[PDB]
Amino acid sequence: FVEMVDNLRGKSGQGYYVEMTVGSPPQTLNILVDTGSSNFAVGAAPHPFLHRYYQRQLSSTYRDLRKGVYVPYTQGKWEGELGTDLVSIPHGPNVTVRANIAAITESDKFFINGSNWEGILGLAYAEIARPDDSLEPFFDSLVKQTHVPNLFSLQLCGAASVGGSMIIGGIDHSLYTGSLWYTPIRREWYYEVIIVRVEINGQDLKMDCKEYNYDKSIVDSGTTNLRLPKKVFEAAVKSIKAASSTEKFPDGFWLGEQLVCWQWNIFPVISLYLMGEVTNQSFRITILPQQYLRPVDCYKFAISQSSTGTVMGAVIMEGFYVVFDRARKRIGFAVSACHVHDEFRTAAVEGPFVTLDMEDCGYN
Ligand SMILES: CC(C)(C)COc1ccc2c(c1)[C@]1(COC(N)=N1)c1cc(-c3cncnc3)ccc1O2
């Protein structure tokens, strides 16, 4: 899988993207990798932010599905025309598949001014696809039409340019150290998982664990921050405040509404315990402040409250090598060979632990 190593690029806080080709002859586009949506959607018109876009008129393999699609999400929207065409990933497996493609013809707050990507690859499941679950997502199409195994994995390496690896169809053992630990995918829509316990510098928050997954917890490469449900964020902040009370900071800062500036150890490690593979067994992943204090001297608090549930975004994923094992309905975590650490503290994946009543932590 060596040709796939380092196939991801990006700029700080504008996501990670992979090179793809669409149409015949192939048209090259940079596409955002998003495990929190399920559509393959590409710029199709000369929006001024775009370096390039899908020109359906140049493709002999393009086919129109004669149907529109409308996608508002919390922070913007896109709209487009559905079709299919031949798709491939140059620094991915050596295969060409016919996939659904949303030709984006109108958007708001979707494309980023200054960014070097022109589309979005939704790697989540059919259920949250638009307009409905019959629009087969890319990865489903990929697996159905080839012998590429039903899994992919992500090493998001962070820092300004970021880099990483999307290993399609397998696992590359050089990208991680120690053992992979697997949490079950509770349901195949988003990559939903269950958090059963939360610790700040070893101190259990002691909240009903139902709170950690109200109304869900997901693993999402298209979100920068670790996002925590309101009640839990509050409780978590209060403990980061207490733990880090060596210095003081404004209330805006904790809300991610102002920065703080200097010219690490005052801040606690954060630990999430995830449901394991066996009854009454968990494991924990541990991240550093290096992961949740983001460079904007100046820094942003990369943890924020949420109304949609826990989102394990880039802040979490940059610590680890993450295996989206769709074949076995599970997600694996291991310490990333590329993650950024002190020579004191370190990102960690440790287990097994004993946790009772893990099923009660899920929300219905
Ligand atoms: C329909 C649905 C399932 C409710 C969600 O559909 C969606 C539809 C469109 C869409 C998303 C979700 C997002 C928003 O969050 C994620 N994961 N992708 C997203 C994130 C980014 C982005 C990532 N990283 C840094 N900066 C920006 C850019 C565009 C973008 O567009």
Instruction: State the structure-solving technique.
Output: X-ray
- Homologous superfamily of 149-364: Acid Proteases (2.40.70.10)
Whether 208 sits among the annotated catalytic residues: the reply is: no
Tell me the best of 12, 73, 130, 311 to mutate to test the pocket of ligand 1, counting ligand atoms within 8 Å of each CB and taking the most.
Answer: 73
Cα–Cα distance between 170 and 150 in angstroms, integer? 8
Residue 34 annotated among the catalytic residues of the structure: yes
- Determine which residue's CA is closest to atom 6 belonging to ligand 1: 37
Which residue in the block uniquely carries the two structure tokens 């025309």?
81
Is the Cβ–Cβ distance between 103 and 81 less than 8 Å? yes
Q: Are strands 217-219 and 176-184 parallel, antiparallel or unpaired?
A: unpaired
Q: Residue 95 — φ and ψ, nearest 5°?
A: -145, 155
Beta-strand pair 330-336/176-184: antiparallel
For the domain made up of 16-148, the CATH class stated in words is mainly beta
- Tell me, in Å, the resolution of the deposited structure: 2.4
Portions of the chain given CATH number 2.40.70.10? 16-148, 149-364
For residue 71 and ligand 1, the question of a CB distance below 6 A is answered with: yes
**Three-class secondary structure assignment of the chain:** CHHHCCCEEEECCCCEEEEEEECCCCEEEEEEEECCCCCEEEECCCCCCCCCCCCHHHCCCCEEEEEEEEEEECCEEEEEEEEEEEEECCCCCCCCEEEEEEEEEEEECCCCCCCCCCEEEECCCHHHCCCCCCCCCHHHHHHHHCCCCCCEEEEECCCCEEEEEEEECCCCHHHEEEEEEEEECCCECCEEECEEEEEECCEECCCCCCHHHCCCEEECCCCCCEEEEHHHHHHHHHHHHHHCCCCCCCHHHHCCCCCEECCCCCCCCEEEEEECCCCCEEEEEEECHHHHEEECCEEEECEEEECCCEEECHHHHCCEEEEEECCCCEEEEEEECCCCCCCCCCCEEEEEEECCCHHHHCCC
Q: Which atom of ligand 1 is nearest to the CA of 78?
A: 9
